[PDB]
Each structure stands twice: as C-alpha cells, then as structure tokens.
Amino acid sequence: SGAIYVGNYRVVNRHLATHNDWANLVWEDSSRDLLVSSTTAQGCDTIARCDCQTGVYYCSSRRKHYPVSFSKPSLIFVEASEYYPARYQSHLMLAVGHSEPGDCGGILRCQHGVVGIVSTGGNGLVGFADVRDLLWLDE
Ligand SMILES: CSc1ccccc1CC(=O)N1C[C@H](C)C[C@H](C(N)=O)C1
Ligand SMILES: [Zn+2]
C-alpha cells in the first residue's frame, strides 16, 4: 500500500484504489496501473521532472529503503491477477531489488523528488510506474 499526495491530488496504484478514490476520480489508466483522485487537504510531496536512472525506494516487506539503478519508462509484459489479464504495462521502469506482493505503493525518489511508485516485481526485480510525465499534477 501507499500513495503520492501533491496539491489537491492523491496518486495510487489503480488495482488498490478505494470507493472514495473512484467517487472523486480525476484520471485513471489501466495500462499504467495508475489512478488519481481529488483531496480537500493540500499535498505533502514534490514531483521530479528529470531523466534520472538512480534513486531510492521504500520496501514495506523489509521495512527498509534501498538504493537502485532503474531503466527508462517503457512497455513491459505482465501476468494475470485478480485485477488484470496478461498485457503490456506502459511507462514502467525495472530495477534489481527485492519486492513481494504487498510492496505496491512504495515511493521511488531521486535528488529531484518523487519519481514513481512500486507496481510490479518478481525474481530479484522490482517495477515502478513512472509519474514524471504527468505535468498537470503540478498545476
Ligand atoms: C511488487 S508486485 C510483485 C512483486 C513480486 C512478485 C509479484 C508481484 C505481483 C505483481 O507484479 N503484480 C500483481 C499485482 C496485483 C498487479 C501488478 C500489475 N501492475 O499488473 C502485477
Ligand atoms: Zn531526478
């Protein structure tokens, strides 16, 4: 679990969104596993606007932050679930690191701010849904 709170927005994994998130829906993309909802309170986080490929993510299954090198946002195949069929997920960045079902929502950050959130993983890998192209989150 976990979310990004920036201004009057809450960014979460689409497969983990609540009834309140869907009732206050701003934008959602099943191909990116992202959903953004409106909030009344002001948000605590800064979004990075960069092409960094190094950062630090939070891993709940270990209660630890880990430093990682990660790939550029791209189309990557992902397997079925109670939420999605076999498909390509766009804007996804992979890194060598630990992740298990439960780690989705953990934040990835570089020196410039919030880069994205944990969204996939498996066999010594971890995938992050990028948010750096969502320029509207700032305005
Ligand atoms: C950190 S997630 C993870 C990690 C290790 C092993 C397995 C997983 C689970 C995982 O990759 N997915 C299941 C999730 C319900 C939806 C995800 C998606 N974005 O389509 C894919
Ligand atoms: Zn950066």
Curated annotation (Swiss-Prot):
Return the protein name: Protease 2A
Determine the domain of life of the protein's source: Viruses
Reaction catalysed by this chain? Selective cleavage of Tyr-|-Gly bond in the picornavirus polyprotein
Q: How does it assemble?
A: Homodimer.
**UniProt-annotated catalytic positions:** H15 (for protease 2a activity), D33 (for protease 2a activity), C104 (for protease 2a activity)
Q: What does this protein do?
A: Cysteine protease that cleaves viral polyprotein and specific host proteins. It is responsible for the autocatalytic cleavage between the P1 and P2 regions, which is the first cleavage occurring in the polyprotein. Also cleaves the host translation initiation factor EIF4G1, in order to shut down the capped cellular mRNA translation. Inhibits the host nucleus-cytoplasm protein and RNA trafficking by cleaving host members of the nuclear pores. Counteracts stress granule formation probably by antagonizing its assembly or promoting its dissassembly.
Q: Which residues hold Zn(2+) 1?
A: C50, C52, C110, H112
